[PDB]
Design a binder for this molecule. Structure first.
Ligand SMILES: *[C@@H]1O[C@H](CO[C@@H]2O[C@@H](C)[C@@H](O)[C@@H](O)[C@@H]2O)[C@@H](O[C@@H]2O[C@H](CO)[C@@H](O)[C@H](O)[C@H]2NC(C)=O)[C@H](O)[C@H]1NC(C)=O
Ligand SMILES: *[C@@H]1O[C@H](CO[C@@H]2O[C@@H](C)[C@@H](O)[C@@H](O)[C@@H]2O)[C@@H](O[C@@H]2O[C@H](CO)[C@@H](O)[C@H](O)[C@H]2NC(C)=O)[C@H](O)[C@H]1NC(C)=O
Ligand SMILES: *[C@@H]1O[C@H](CO[C@@H]2O[C@@H](C)[C@@H](O)[C@@H](O)[C@@H]2O)[C@@H](O[C@@H]2O[C@H](CO)[C@@H](O)[C@H](O)[C@H]2NC(C)=O)[C@H](O)[C@H]1NC(C)=O
Ligand SMILES: *[C@@H]1O[C@H](CO[C@@H]2O[C@@H](C)[C@@H](O)[C@@H](O)[C@@H]2O)[C@@H](O[C@@H]2O[C@H](CO)[C@@H](O)[C@H](O)[C@H]2NC(C)=O)[C@H](O)[C@H]1NC(C)=O
Ligand SMILES: *[C@@H]1O[C@H](CO[C@@H]2O[C@@H](C)[C@@H](O)[C@@H](O)[C@@H]2O)[C@@H](O[C@@H]2O[C@H](CO)[C@@H](O)[C@H](O)[C@H]2NC(C)=O)[C@H](O)[C@H]1NC(C)=O
Ligand SMILES: *[C@@H]1O[C@H](CO[C@@H]2O[C@@H](C)[C@@H](O)[C@@H](O)[C@@H]2O)[C@@H](O[C@@H]2O[C@H](CO)[C@@H](O)[C@H](O)[C@H]2NC(C)=O)[C@H](O)[C@H]1NC(C)=O
Ligand SMILES: *[C@@H]1O[C@H](CO)[C@@H](O)[C@H](O)[C@H]1NC(C)=O
Ligand SMILES: *[C@@H]1O[C@H](CO)[C@@H](O)[C@H](O)[C@H]1NC(C)=O
Ligand SMILES: *[C@@H]1O[C@H](CO)[C@@H](O)[C@H](O)[C@H]1NC(C)=O
Ligand SMILES: *[C@@H]1O[C@H](CO)[C@@H](O)[C@H](O)[C@H]1NC(C)=O
Ligand SMILES: *[C@@H]1O[C@H](CO)[C@@H](O)[C@H](O)[C@H]1NC(C)=O
Ligand SMILES: *[C@@H]1O[C@H](CO)[C@@H](O)[C@H](O)[C@H]1NC(C)=O
Ligand SMILES: *[C@@H]1O[C@H](CO)[C@@H](O)[C@H](O)[C@H]1NC(C)=O
Ligand SMILES: *[C@@H]1O[C@H](CO)[C@@H](O)[C@H](O)[C@H]1NC(C)=O
Ligand SMILES: *[C@@H]1O[C@H](CO)[C@@H](O)[C@H](O)[C@H]1NC(C)=O
Ligand SMILES: [Cl-]
Ligand SMILES: [Cl-]
Ligand SMILES: [Cl-]
Lengths: 526, 526, 526
């Protein structure tokens, strides 16, 4: 041991790891599709022709091409999200963590990484399945999927650049688990997708894709949903951007297919560079190349499918963090530094609004100003206001609204409001419970003793881990043993959600009702 | 392209068309059965023996034999409904419009043309599927089916003239789509029939035929339903008429089969001529040769099947136009011209009644007079009254009552009251929102810019097109994106329907409750 | 006759027996697995390689290894439970009683014997299926399964001593009935498990095991349920005990598998001897080697599975006896003899508590004292109090609570409170309606005329037999013919149960509500 699994594609060697005085077998870097190179760039992921021999699956594989956030070189806070393996066009691999001893029929969890469809990789320390396998005895799988232009370049209906390639990657990863996980003792019949930010959005898209209906069982959505403003691109911009990219690399043409031929020949880095520029103005949140209505993976605008109950029927767990917005302020909002406590002026608030809502009518920005700056004298007012604006508009509202409309079609849905600030959080107090900073608690990182999270925090993680685990296994996110708070189903009438924190978890109603009325009812009209 | 599809019968070449700066592939004139000639006249449609080679499907096929309305030669208003291809006994072809690029799993719409089972053809400009394919990205199919004696000559249980042949045509067209549409990327599992007048009535008959149960998914019924007075013929008249036709062409006999032998030998035109005469007196609405209880396609009187829940269970969309009746006044009601504004006298009203209800007891006509001429002094009174009489009795009531009884068996049904007068309507103001004059808005004709419908009208059509499209795809006729009125389900209790027009669409209750009580409860008894 | 059945394993000869002037065919001692010897000790039961020839199945087979209760040598009361055939490692056989004449499609009852997973055998006189076959014309099957260390030695995940072997025995017995009972005219589709004490607990475990889902139909649970304090062992003690046993027989080691190798070589009796000693202190109720969460038969802690509806959905019949506790007092509670009427002092009561709750905090024992000794002056007070304590805590509460949570997931459940003292009961009046002393009435022993139960008692048994029989056959424990009390469904709200006794059976609510609140809500926290 020496431990080999016989996948319907070939053999793969794992590697034992120690976890809290236990063994977990890790299979890192298994290829699930055929490297999408040269002639395959911009295409749907291709079948894997069975390899002969043993695949040594003992190091994370190459992350996919992407730009790297370099606002704060050396800063953990920002860098912990940067890829930690070689960027490459060759990146369609996935990881599996089965607990040891090999389990009989384990529920499988599949992770999908966030990062605006532009950045991300499964190999991040915060996405380490090894703990979940150890503690809740499930199999955890994660995959890498193409991002930015390379994964979502869209030339509508044109099979050369049909769009949503990254999404199809994910899907092929699901098929893989479908055909193989049993060999590791996984139960293909009990599969729960979960992701965060674009990850969550992807999870939600899978609920809508018929292609995915049967590739999984349940779904968890952490800070994100397709109906978020940043998540889907109109078939119009999709084109404008594909063309803009073409111009920007001297690839303009007559035969459309030729433009793809052209681009198929540029250097990854030359593409990665211009991506930033295919829109007139951008935001800290610009998702330049994302999912589109391709009439393949997505068969119609998804708000319509959601609206009219056209999606997998099953339970869902959904939730957000107390301060989704803050993380972004520091990438362009005048007055905001990660270093000063970023008190800003009314004048600057107006300024911040211009940054996050570039194309929005002057009236539109006025309404936002008006709704959020109706003060309850206090210095931080405008600072926090702009936070919530971004928070509420990009994450918390579309999140809530998805949950709402989904449960209307008769399914159980649970909602959480995560409101705990890791005490090891490298960013400043004021950014509060930040976007993406619950992931570590979900993957159970605080369970690691020599790690310096607090006792409070170890407990919390242990609880969440269980709730999630349970939700995966039985479609019910209860913690039944340590006298916990019962987590109520989210009905479209009363709209209850559970708060997650180290003190007391409480049951509450109608999260951000006031604000989301504005974002949901009024603002789409300006 | 050059674009060939490989049907389970042979190959067929389509033809690209430009539509609002887009391509749609049209396959016009595909044969779906084996020409019903000489020995096959009056029989059920026969299997198509696979052809060798390529079928060029690039012009509409022959319309089927029928008489032609010649009240108003040169008048668009009446002539737009006349066949626009060669009449022929050889006419069992169908059209398909798939949007381009070829879609993956498109919902299919099948059109069935109206015209009292006596007239009609799929090739009419107003039945042009090319727009629907373009705009809502569905596949549209329409077929021609035998009409008048040639399609509904009934000699009950006699396999030579078993009746309902035209209906079986339609059905074979459905089987065709069932076996083939996938090759064009159609999804046989999501098929919605829709039709108008006799078309609608046919749609409704298919809900009752077991032979059709599995050949489609949903149903739309525009101004018509089997339970309409004109729609089904008693097994008695069916015979009286088959014999009368025989006498009228010197075909009378002893061996019944011989009468068919005889008639199988006359010239189409000789049959078409006498059709008009097989009844003692007729009306502008006489459907001389129609669907009968053949114990094959219809297995029992259909009002009983409807009454006792014996039909496909599924959603239905049903509706009528504000002025169904007027169109007919001008083909015999004394005082009515398309040219003068047709004010008529009480004496003439009585006269009109005689025309539309020939066989009805003197008392019967008195009740009608009495119920409708209870004035609210105004000149047009009697004119409008006679309109509604015909409207309410032939269309609006049986329409409503069908919906009612159908939804009682637990299915979702939606009802519309179409009340907009095309501004390009060749008939006079007084005829108002006329019978058959919503078809063009359903097929999206006003979407064509250089066409001179109003802006109001383009919007409306765009809306209807969507609602229909949606209803086809998801069984829900909502327009979810442009802040529209929600279209309520039609319950047998509250009876809500949605009004369709250019100003505001409203939700209302109990369409023509007063009048339909009379037509439904009282009149069948006189 | 001479009567041979052709099992998918070989032939087996039965033996006619006379029963109330009738014949019943008994097939005693059929092997259902391959003797678990030497190399197979501690393993899951192994397939039976088809034997050639006829198996004479005409005497009960060997009981399995176990210790023998020798507190009261010669006393029927205690000895009637001791094994009545040779103890042997070779003991995987089962009995079948089919009524004669061979029935067509009889409902099958499978008995599972109690005895703390430490003791028991199917051959006991009180488990004699011959009467049930005769009277209710069903097939009764019972099996022997490994007990104590030999059947539940657990070395978690280690396939050498994977734990729950006895449980798997039972399961293999169920598979057997599944594959074969038809040959005896049994209907594999209508199979009801029933058992008592550990038997019941086992029945309940089968409701949770997916491995068993499809091996039976309904379930009856007499004085016992997995959620009883004595029924499942934590994966921690399971190990501590496997090691302690190792030390105690000089079997300690490095390679775990070696410890099994070691133990695989000791003499049964050497193992049986030390079993008593693997815990620090014990109780009259100590179930030293029992079912554990093996992640095979049990796939997760069972309270969680029960809590979250993860079990076979089907009807259940559950119940307890009026005085479950008394039976145990006499194996260690100071003051209690089966010979004096065992009045005890407050000081002794405290003393008794120490015996039954050894590890429990001083506070914990105080609460018990406090809750139960709040007197209503009467001498027996403390005597009865300590009885109920043991009764309520080990049996009646966990019994009730199981029923409650089970019915919450939408299944019909019936509850009985058996409160009749056999007049042939060898123990003293004060022990009242004792643990295990309804079994004889269920198997219909009082139906035997020359047997000296009373008339009252014959009736009662006849009634129970019927109710059970009915419950097995139709999932409804009614006695429909002799004007009986209707037995209400047990809802989680009103909690009705039926009392069983010779006078009048009554419908009552909320059995031991006061006390079980304490045991269920408060005590798990001390
Ligand atoms: C679609 O793109 C056009 C062109 O974008 C420009 O050229 C690209 C290659 C890239 O370099 C971008 O940064 C450029 O902006 C857009 O037209 C531009 O944007 C606005 C028009 O609203 C205008 O201020 C700029 O001057 C235009 N650029 C030039 C020089 O033409 C346009 O925004 C996009 N179309 C829509 C409506 O989405
Ligand atoms: C808060 O800090 C921001 C960010 O400035 C950077 O970080 C600070 C710690 C400090 O070291 C600055 O010098 C760094 O540049 C300040 O934003 C700057 O403000 C002035 C105008 O007021 C302007 O000249 C800079 O270009 C600004 N930088 C940007 C791009 O916003 C801000 O003023 C500080 N606010 C307070 C009052 O604390
Ligand atoms: C069935 O038909 C008879 C005969 O119809 C007539 O002959 C046909 C060939 C055709 O030429 C029709 O126009 C003729 O009317 C019907 O009997 C006639 O109708 C009424 C009787 O109610 C009477 O006024 C006519 O004189 C009859 N014609 C003759 C000359 O016999 C009759 O209406 C039909 N039967 C029923 C009850 O439906
Ligand atoms: C309305 O018009 C009808 C239809 O008549 C035809 O069209 C008119 C525009 C006019 O040009 C007529 O001459 C055309 O014949 C009139 O109906 C006629 O009325 C008279 C008796 O009053 C009669 O001699 C004709 O035969 C009728 N035609 C028929 C078959 O109905 C009608 O009188 C006009 N009504 C008014 C007052 O406007
Ligand atoms: C697990 O077992 C240890 C050891 O049990 C002892 O040795 C066994 C072979 C057997 O002979 C037992 O009877 C022995 O008790 C337990 O430790 C003992 O129990 C308590 C500690 O709580 C203490 O009073 C004894 O002295 C310990 N025995 C010795 C001499 O070490 C212990 O109870 C078990 N562990 C747990 C926490 O369950
Ligand atoms: C009730 O009897 C118990 C059990 O004692 C045995 O059975 C009795 C019938 C009698 O014959 C005893 O001698 C037998 O030993 C008595 O328990 C004993 O009590 C005394 C102390 O009071 C003690 O010396 C013994 O060891 C005890 N035995 C045990 C292990 O409990 C009890 O005293 C009797 N109680 C009364 C008052 O009836
Ligand atoms: C794969 O890696 C392992 C590392 O221990 C080794 O046993 C084996 O030789 C390797 N096989 C190769 C060289 O591919
Ligand atoms: C695993 O569990 C499922 C139940 O969801 C079952 O159907 C499947 O056959 C099991 N496979 C095994 C026996 O491991
Ligand atoms: C409950 O808390 C106990 C500590 O008392 C711990 O052992 C266990 O892991 C906890 N369970 C969960 C699900 O948090
Ligand atoms: C069918 O029609 C098309 C028209 O372009 C042509 O390409 C082809 O030759 C035709 N085949 C024949 C003659 O049937
Ligand atoms: C098309 O869609 C249906 C779902 O209604 C599906 O069952 C069918 O297999 C699909 N065919 C494809 C994959 O195109
Ligand atoms: C909604 O209206 C917009 C114009 O603002 C138009 O682009 C779109 O087609 C409309 N949608 C429907 C379904 O009418
Ligand atoms: C089995 O036992 C019966 C007892 O009557 C007898 O008929 C038969 O000979 C026996 N067969 C043997 C010896 O195994
Ligand atoms: C016995 O009864 C079952 C009904 O539960 C039936 O399905 C099965 O085929 C029967 N076998 C026979 C005919 O004995
Ligand atoms: C009902 O009582 C009668 C005696 O009157 C008896 O024959 C019969 O067995 C009884 N039935 C049951 C189910 O006890
Ligand atoms: Cl808050
Ligand atoms: Cl009106
Ligand atoms: Cl009691």
């Amino acid at each position: 041991d020496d431990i080999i699994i016989a996948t319907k594609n070939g053999k793969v060697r794992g590697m034992q790891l120690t976890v809290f005085g236990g063994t977990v077998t890790a299979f890192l870097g298994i290829p699930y599709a055929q490297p999408p190179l040269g002639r395959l760039r911009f295409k749907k992921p291709q079948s894997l022709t069975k390899w002969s021999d043993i695949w040594n699956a003992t190091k994370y594989a190459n992350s996919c091409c992407q730009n790297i956030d370099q606002s704060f070189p050396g800063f953990h806070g920002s860098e912990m999200w940067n890829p930690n393996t070689d960027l490459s066009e060759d990146c369609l691999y996935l990881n599996v963590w089965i607990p040891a001893p090999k389990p009989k029929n384990a529920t499988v969890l599949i992770w999908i990484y966030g990062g605006g469809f532009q950045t991300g990789t499964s190999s991040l320390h915060v996405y380490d399945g090894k703990f979940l396998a150890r503690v809740e005895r499930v199999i955890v799988v994660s995959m890498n999927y193409r991002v930015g232009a390379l994964g979502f370049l869209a030339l509508p209906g044109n099979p050369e650049a049909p769009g949503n390639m990254g999404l199809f990657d994910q899907q092929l990863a699901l098929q893989w688990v479908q055909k193989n996980i049993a060999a590791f003792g996984g139960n293909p019949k009990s599969v729960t997708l979960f992701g965060e930010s674009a990850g969550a959005a992807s999870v939600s898209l899978h609920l809508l894709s018929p292609g995915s209906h049967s590739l999984f069982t349940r779904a968890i959505l952490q800070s994100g949903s397709f109906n978020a403003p940043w998540a889907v691109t109109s078939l119009y911009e999709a084109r404008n951007r594909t063309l803009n990219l073409a111009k920007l690399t001297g690839c303009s043409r007559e035969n459309e297919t030729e433009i793809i031929k052209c681009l198929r020949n540029k250097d990854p880095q030359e593409i990665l560079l211009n991506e930033a520029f295919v829109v007139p103005y951008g935001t800290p949140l610009s998702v330049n190349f994302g999912p589109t209505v391709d009439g393949d993976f997505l068969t119609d605008m998804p708000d319509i499918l959601l609206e009219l109950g056209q999606f997998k029927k099953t339970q869902i767990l959904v939730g957000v963090n107390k301060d989704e917005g803050t993380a972004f302020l520091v990438y362009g909002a005048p007055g905001f530094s990660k270093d000063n406590n970023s008190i800003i002026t009314r004048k600057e608030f107006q300024e911040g609004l211009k940054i996050f809502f570039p194309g929005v009518s002057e009236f539109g920005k006025e309404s936002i100003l008006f709704h959020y700056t109706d003060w309850v004298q206090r210095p931080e007012n405008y600072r926090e206001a702009l936070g919530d604006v971004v928070g509420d508009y990009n994450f918390i509202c579309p999140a809530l609204e998805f949950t709402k409309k989904f449960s209307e079609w008769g399914n159980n849905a649970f909602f959480y409001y995560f409101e705990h600030r890791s005490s090891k959080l490298p960013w400043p107090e004021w950014m509060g419970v930040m976007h993406g900073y619950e992931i570590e608690f979900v993957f159970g990182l605080p369970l690691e003793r020599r790690d310096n999270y607090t006792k409070a925090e170890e407990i919390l993680s242990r609880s969440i881990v269980k709730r999630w685990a349970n939700f995966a296994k039985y479609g019910n996110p209860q913690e039944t043993q340590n006298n916990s708070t019962s987590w109520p189903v989210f009905k479209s009438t009363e709209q209850k959600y559970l708060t997650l924190n180290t003190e007391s978890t409480r049951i509450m109603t109608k999260l951000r009702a006031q604000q989301c009325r504005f974002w949901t009812s009024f603002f789409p009209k300006v």
